Design an enzyme around this catalytic site. Structure first.
Site, PDB file in Angstrom:
ATOM      1  N   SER A  44       9.006  37.285  89.111  1.00 28.94           N
ATOM      2  CA  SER A  44       8.444  37.193  90.462  1.00 28.94           C
ATOM      3  C   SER A  44       9.286  36.337  91.416  1.00 28.94           C
ATOM      4  O   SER A  44       9.006  36.292  92.613  1.00 28.94           O
ATOM      5  CB  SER A  44       7.016  36.649  90.421  1.00 28.94           C
ATOM      6  OG  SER A  44       6.093  37.663  90.069  1.00 28.94           O
ATOM      7  N   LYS A  47      10.703  37.869  94.596  1.00 33.63           N
ATOM      8  CA  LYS A  47       9.880  38.091  95.783  1.00 33.63           C
ATOM      9  C   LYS A  47      10.433  37.342  96.995  1.00 33.63           C
ATOM     10  O   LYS A  47      10.211  37.746  98.135  1.00 33.63           O
ATOM     11  CB  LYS A  47       8.435  37.671  95.516  1.00 33.63           C
ATOM     12  CG  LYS A  47       7.735  38.542  94.486  1.00 33.63           C
ATOM     13  CD  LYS A  47       6.303  38.100  94.244  1.00 33.63           C
ATOM     14  CE  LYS A  47       5.670  38.890  93.110  1.00 33.63           C
ATOM     15  NZ  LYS A  47       4.287  38.427  92.810  1.00 33.63           N
ATOM     16  N   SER A 104       1.786  34.879  94.504  1.00 34.53           N
ATOM     17  CA  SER A 104       2.425  35.878  93.641  1.00 34.53           C
ATOM     18  C   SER A 104       1.523  37.093  93.440  1.00 34.53           C
ATOM     19  O   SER A 104       1.433  37.639  92.340  1.00 34.53           O
ATOM     20  CB  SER A 104       2.801  35.267  92.289  1.00 34.53           C
ATOM     21  OG  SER A 104       4.054  35.762  91.842  1.00 34.53           O
ATOM     22  N   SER A 211       6.869  34.844  85.944  1.00 30.58           N
ATOM     23  CA  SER A 211       6.523  34.964  84.535  1.00 30.58           C
ATOM     24  C   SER A 211       6.666  36.416  84.101  1.00 30.58           C
ATOM     25  O   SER A 211       6.533  37.330  84.914  1.00 30.58           O
ATOM     26  CB  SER A 211       5.086  34.497  84.304  1.00 30.58           C
ATOM     27  OG  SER A 211       4.167  35.357  84.952  1.00 30.58           O
TER      28      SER A 211
END
Ligand code: K
Length: 262
Positions: A44, A47, A104, A211
């Site tokens: 993530s 992003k 997230s 993760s």
């Protein structure tokens, strides 16, 4: 091999996984690397590149961040705490950016990716700002499969640190947009157990976690130490077994070693 590298190696050995670290200290532009040129799955932390790309678009479209995006029931994936409130409604690209970065939200990330024409659009932006290493290949959630040896959705710690610096402290974005990105990162909700947990409380952090499978546990941060010029710190960690547990403590420990070695 430096003292700090030897401490990071000891940490890695006791962890049973593979650790990647890159520090840039903008006081003197010096770097500290550990497996800095090995590829890790971003999960993530990718992003940040997607949100930044949409910020770059917004430089030539004043209203872009206010643009509504339809959220449909089919759009929901594995983790979507913000988007699921807006199913059969809309979120703005600003709302999607904040949701992706600060919570997230994976559905929000997928809307950013779509706004950029797919995962290749995010990679194209990376190339445009001088990052030749980053690659995004897939949407969420499968961009988090984090399979050992798989080049998809990876970068190196050195590359990410350099890019995060350019985005947040340098001139890859316009001033307003840079400020917005930094504001979003500083408002992250997910970060307190990771890099931040290894730093002195007085230091100010904006970060994005990640993760995935193989116990993959990531964090990338821009840090304003007490009385010091800012740092940029990447910590990547991934483990041999698919169903390994997260180890945010290992990121904290890496950050502590880096902090104590300044
Ligand atoms: K996991």
């Amino acid at each position: 091999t430096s003292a700090v590298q030897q401490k990071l190696a000891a940490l890695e050995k006791s962890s049973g996984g593979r650790l990647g670290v890159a520090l840039i200290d903008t006081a003197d532009n010096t770097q500290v690397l550990y497996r800095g040129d090995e590829r890790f799955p971003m999960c993530s932390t990718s992003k940040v590149m997607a949100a930044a790309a949409v910020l770059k678009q917004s430089e030539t479209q004043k209203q872009l961040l206010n643009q509504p995006v339809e959220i449909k029931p089919a759009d929901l994936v594995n983790y979507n705490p913000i988007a699921e409130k807006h199913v059969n409604g809309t979120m703005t690209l600003a709302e999607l950016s904040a949701a992706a970065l600060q919570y997230s939200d994976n559905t929000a990330m997928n809307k950013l990716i779509a706004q950029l024409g797919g995962p290749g659009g995010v990679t194209a932006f990376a190339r445009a700002i001088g990052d030749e290493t980053f690659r995004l290949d897939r949407t969420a959630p499968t961009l988090n499969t984090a399979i050992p040896g798989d080049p998809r959705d990876t970068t190196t710690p050195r590359a990410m640190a350099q890019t995060l610096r350019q985005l947040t402290l340098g001139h890859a974005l316009g001033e307003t947009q840079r400020a917005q990105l930094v504001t979003w990162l500083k408002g992250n909700t997910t970060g307190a157990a990771s890099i931040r947990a290894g730093l002195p409380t007085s230091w100010t952090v904006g970060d994005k976690t990640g993760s995935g499978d193989y116990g993959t546990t990531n964090d990338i941060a821009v840090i304003w130490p007490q009385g010091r010029a800012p740092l940029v710190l990447v910590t990547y960690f991934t483990q041999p077994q698919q169903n390994a547990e997260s180890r945010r403590d290992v990121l904290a420990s890496a950050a502590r070693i880096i902090a104590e070695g300044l």
